Symmetry: D2
Subunit: 124 residues, 4 copies
């Protein structure tokens, strides 16, 4: 029901993210800057505020969220025990079903081990 | 370097777990009761005490540990950022390498979604 | 609807496999010897004979079947395009749904990479 | 050592694919049209011709290859038993190691179940 988008410094690309979010059926808008820290939540804090039990979460791609699956799992799983579920759009995954949670944390597993192998490529 | 085993109330099965742990190369002994709670750590607390940076963790099977991957990932990943790594025996996985962490949290993903589908089978 | 069990040379363990298969709801019986080859099908050939479109497959564990996921995927996927589906019991997976096929070939992926790491442990 | 790229009808995008392939270290060039069939190999047939034992395979993304993991696994696994290995670039996976084959066929698993859920979205 509620959507959120992450980007660096340019805000023209989010306009066509926002478009597809609305079309996918959601109510409210949230967008953040990445200039500073991408694992310290800025205006995502307000997304946790305006969210209540039964409702859901809108995400284009898992990667555009935080990527660190240690930090990821230990957050979405807290909503799981707060009564609120989460779906990922072009990732194509829901947390609603136990069978469904699986694709999630293996895509979340992949998302980290993605960054973890990409970031070490920079060294040698 | 340090080993730990989980069981219900009988302690003859752990004797041949202990045997294979020693053979696999480890120093100290830790064993707990399951009578009460399996997600509230009893004498595992002492395993976190006698453990220091660089050292490792010995586990026969991931399942015999806690199973709840929300609770699992948010613990081993803390050692990952504490400088201490972890290997799983007959699960056949290490956390040492980033490529290696993968098999881990998809086996940990599996371990939860195992219990999650087993426990719901009891209902209807 | 139709069940199959794999074992080495002793046939007392299959009796309590057979029991749980029947209870899980299936019609016919199939059991093979492993003395010789485990990737060359013996009396499984008859299971492909007495099987028709719409019907399903009964398996206790994926491992007790062949394990080689190159050989596995390239067989079950043939039924997938023959109109016949497959479910795995204590593995807890169906091929019926596309979302469901996933847990399958990652458990099938695991089953191979299990044997592949177990068999290389024998060397050095 | 040898590279291959897949595209629809425009050939300007492959020019910057080709660029990164060369930089990643490979010898020869192969590119195909997608106008007709994407699961019936056209000028990929020549890639199987000019390839010998010990050598490797270059792929930008698994998806840009065929996607059908039934058809995928039952091909790469044939090289696996032909002595020739395969690496995937921005997918970041090799088949060289048994531990490595894993990320592969779960990314290959993902690639299919990607298309399988994308293609069914078109219906209703």
């Amino acid at each position: 029901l509620i959507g959120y988008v992450r980007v660096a410094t340019n805000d023209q690309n989010t306009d066509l993210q926002r478009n597809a979010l609305v079309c996918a059926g959601c109510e409210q808008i949230f967008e953040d800057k990445l200039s500073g820290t991408r694992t310290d939540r800025p205006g995502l804090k307000r997304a946790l505020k305006r969210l209540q039990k039964g409702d859901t979460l809108v995400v284009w791609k898992l990667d555009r969220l935080g990527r660190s699956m240690k930090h990821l799992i230990s957050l979405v799983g807290e909503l799981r025990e707060r009564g609120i579920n989460f779906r990922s759009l072009t990732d194509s995954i829901d947390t609603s079903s136990p069978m469904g949670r699986f694709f999630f944390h293996v895509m979340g597993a992949l998302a980290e081990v993605e960054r973890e192998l990409i970031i070490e490529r920079t060294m040698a």
